[PDB]
Amino acid sequence: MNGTEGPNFYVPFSNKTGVVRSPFEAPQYYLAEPWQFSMLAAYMFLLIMLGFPINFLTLYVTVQHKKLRTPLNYILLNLAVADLFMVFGGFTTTLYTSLHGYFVFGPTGCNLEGFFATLGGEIALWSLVVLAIERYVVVCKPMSNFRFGENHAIMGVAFTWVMALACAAPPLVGWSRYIPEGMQCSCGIDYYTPHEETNNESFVIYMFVVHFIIPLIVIFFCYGQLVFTVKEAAAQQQESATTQKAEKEVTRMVIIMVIAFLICWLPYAGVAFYIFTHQGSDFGPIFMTIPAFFAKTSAVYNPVIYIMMNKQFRNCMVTTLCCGKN
Amino acid sequence: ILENLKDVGLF
Ligand SMILES: *[C@@H]1O[C@H](CO)[C@@H](O[C@@H]2O[C@H](CO)[C@@H](O[C@@H]3O[C@H](CO)[C@@H](O)[C@H](O[C@@H]4O[C@H](CO)[C@@H](O)[C@H](O)[C@@H]4O)[C@@H]3O)[C@H](O)[C@H]2NC(C)=O)[C@H](O)[C@H]1NC(C)=O
Ligand SMILES: CCCCCCCCO[C@@H]1O[C@H](CO)[C@@H](O)[C@H](O)[C@H]1O
Ligand SMILES: CCCCCCCCO[C@@H]1O[C@H](CO)[C@@H](O)[C@H](O)[C@H]1O
Ligand SMILES: CCCCCCCCO[C@@H]1O[C@H](CO)[C@@H](O)[C@H](O)[C@H]1O
Ligand SMILES: CCCCCCCCO[C@@H]1O[C@H](CO)[C@@H](O)[C@H](O)[C@H]1O
Ligand SMILES: CCCCCCCCO[C@@H]1O[C@H](CO)[C@@H](O)[C@H](O)[C@H]1O
Ligand SMILES: *C(=O)CCCCCCCCCCCCCCC
């Protein structure tokens, strides 16, 4: 026996010695040293100090620069708002709780923190899907005489909200559940214990298929088509050095985007798959925070890739931060 | 294709 079970939790540490306590009631210094809880807090501090300015600045320059308020940019605004739900739903909470060594807000605060942090990351995830569907529709021109307007952009944002609610709300009404994960300082979906009263197994399947595989297929199809269309256009227009440059830039950005998506979600999907197929094995607290580390750092590196590496946003940000220079 | 690439933020 490798863990300790409670009504609303699973502590990944055996109670053979009798030292295990409810992660809602007492510190968990028996599954990690205090200095590791301090390093957890230090990491949350890093993600706040970087993730908040980068994502807030994205909203701010959009308010100050008229040319940013285009429909194809709406979804990037959505990305920045979603990353802020991650910053204040999860990161700040986990900074606070880690300094106590346990989840001081109780089962209720566990559902709040789990709902808003999972909602933030799922809005961000489906924003990357919708961004690719749109780029594919606009560049590859799969439809006859279709012009992408403001109402399509709003439809795309609402679709991300609905898809993220379809992931974050069921654990509040009895399909899966929210419990403290890893070092017991942050709450997330229970994708690792076979809690049958909330039907965890079928929810993890539904998560794996609908919120990982389908986003993976759509992103790969849409950008595969986009790279193919751009390479086809450049091959048929080799007298244009700019078009050859565009082809190289699009291919480089597409590689960065799909690699960044894999770095963000493949560890969560891999660990969940391994736990699913090897049901009945020891999975420690710090090992469980590895896929959390990868997914949460995307609140910093997604806006670097999708905002700061975008010519228009970078120009306006530099202008805003340097008071008025180019 | 170039104008569409600029619109979507890829070039
Ligand atoms: C990991 O393993 C730990 C060791 O078993 C376990 O801790 C124990 O939890 C039990 C309660 O479930 C504690 O029991 C109480 O101890 C106090 C003081 O010794 C007693 O007073 C109390 O008795 C009560 O007496 C009342 C008299 O009016 C009576 O009305 C009440 O009904 C009741 O009988 C209990 O005996 C025990 O002390 C704990 N031991 C330690 C070492 O902490 C952890 O809960 C377990 N961890 C998890 C997460 O489950
Ligand atoms: C950003 C603000 C962080 C708040 C730090 C909370 C620390 C919890 O304070 C706790 O109070 C008790 C009083 O002795 C003790 O049990 C603990 O040693 C102490 O950590
Ligand atoms: C795709 C893998 C199968 C499902 C595993 C779900 C575990 C993820 O957990 C959830 O996802 C969020 C990211 O948006 C985490 O940051 C949150 O802590 C949590 O709510
Ligand atoms: C996520 C949305 C992507 C699904 C779209 C299915 C595309 C089916 O196939 C596509 O249809 C286009 C229509 O003219 C054709 O031009 C293309 O040859 C073909 O790639
Ligand atoms: C070949 C398939 C093309 C279908 C086009 C989708 C419908 C777009 O037409 C709709 O009508 C509104 C009228 O103002 C537009 O402004 C909206 O953008 C749009 O929702
Ligand atoms: C999901 C879409 C994945 C993108 C596949 C990228 C394949 C192109 O990658 C490489 O790019 C080089 C420079 O452009 C070329 O020399 C090669 O043709 C090509 O192999
Ligand atoms: C108008 O010209 C404003 C110019 C601002 C230039 C300021 C350069 C300082 C860079 C700040 C980096 C501080 C990092 C601190 C780490 C905690």
Side-chain angles (χ1 to χ4, degrees):
Chain A
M1 194 157 304
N2 289 314
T4 300
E5 293 189 292
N8 294 315
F9 59 81
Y10 173 80
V11 182
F13 193 92
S14 168
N15 207 20
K16 232 152 33 185
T17 55
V19 302
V20 178
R21 304 290 177 265
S22 173
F24 303 126
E25 303 288 7
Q28 306 287 304
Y29 295 140
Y30 49 77
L31 43 78
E33 316 227 58
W35 76 262
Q36 296 170 304
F37 281 92
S38 285
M39 284 319 294
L40 172 62
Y43 195 67
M44 298 299 112
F45 189 64
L46 186 59
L47 298 185
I48 294 167
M49 291 291 102
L50 304 180
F52 170 74
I54 300 182
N55 286 286
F56 180 84
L57 184 64
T58 302
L59 307 186
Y60 182 84
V61 299
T62 296
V63 175
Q64 310 285 15
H65 293 261
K66 178 196 293 183
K67 286 295 166 280
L68 292 176
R69 295 194 290 271
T70 56
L72 293 162
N73 277 0
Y74 285 15
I75 199 68
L76 297 168
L77 263 275
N78 198 44
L79 174 61
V81 169
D83 288 353
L84 287 170
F85 277 78
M86 298 169 62
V87 159
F88 295 101
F91 298 171
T92 56
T93 312
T94 297
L95 172 60
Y96 190 74
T97 65
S98 63
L99 298 171
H100 303 250
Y102 70 101
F103 195 85
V104 289
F105 295 127
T108 295
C110 188
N111 290 294
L112 280 161
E113 200 244 51
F115 174 79
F116 285 107
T118 291
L119 187 74
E122 290 298 312
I123 296 170
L125 153 61
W126 284 100
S127 284
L128 303 192
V129 169
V130 166
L131 181 56
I133 295 181
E134 290 175 353
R135 295 177 163 172
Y136 156 77
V137 158
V138 166
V139 173
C140 303
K141 288 149 135 178
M143 259 147 291
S144 195
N145 281 267
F146 176 87
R147 188 190 292 264
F148 183 89
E150 193 190 0
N151 290 155
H152 308 115
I154 299 164
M155 182 193 77
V157 175
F159 175 77
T160 63
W161 299 355
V162 167
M163 285 294 116
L165 273 149
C167 167
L172 296 170
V173 283
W175 196 20
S176 187
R177 63 182 186 165
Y178 289 107
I179 63 175
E181 75 186 333
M183 292 163 86
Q184 303 299 284
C185 290
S186 42
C187 288
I189 294 161
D190 179 6
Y191 67 90
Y192 45 95
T193 82
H195 198 249
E196 288 150 21
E197 238 79 348
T198 51
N199 292 124
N200 284 15
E201 170 186 315
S202 72
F203 183 87
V204 183
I205 292 295
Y206 154 83
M207 276 290 283
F208 189 81
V209 173
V210 172
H211 300 268
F212 174 66
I213 293 297
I214 287 183
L216 193 60
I217 291 170
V218 168
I219 284 182
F220 263 85
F221 177 82
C222 286
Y223 281 142
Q225 297 289 263
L226 204 152
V227 164
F228 179 80
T229 288
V230 174
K231 290 198 189 298
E232 215 179 9
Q236 201 62 15
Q237 201 160 7
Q238 267 155 217
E239 70 279 13
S240 169
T242 291
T243 310
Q244 308 315 113
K245 268 172 266 175
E247 168 227 1
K248 294 206 172 203
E249 240 304 289
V250 175
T251 297
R252 198 187 63 102
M253 286 301 308
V254 162
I255 291 176
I256 294 162
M257 286 182 299
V258 310
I259 288 191
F261 178 89
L262 293 177
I263 295 178
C264 181
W265 290 106
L266 205 62
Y268 254 140
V271 169
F273 182 99
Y274 183 87
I275 290 173
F276 193 102
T277 57
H278 300 57
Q279 271 291 342
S281 277
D282 181 285
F283 298 100
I286 291 176
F287 163 88
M288 292 278 296
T289 61
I290 287 170
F293 156 89
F294 276 106
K296 274 169 192 163
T297 313
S298 77
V300 182
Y301 62 68
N302 276 340
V304 168
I305 292 171
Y306 291 93
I307 302 297
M308 275 172 51
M309 289 181 69
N310 172 308
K311 223 174 197 65
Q312 253 204 152
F313 277 90
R314 187 174 65 255
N315 286 340
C316 296
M317 280 177 168
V318 165
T319 296
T320 291
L321 287 175
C322 300
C323 328
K325 200 192 166 181
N326 143 274
Chain B
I1 202 172
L2 257 30
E3 227 221 42
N4 287 335
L5 293 184
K6 188 210 185 193
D7 293 332
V8 304
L10 287 178
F11 186 67

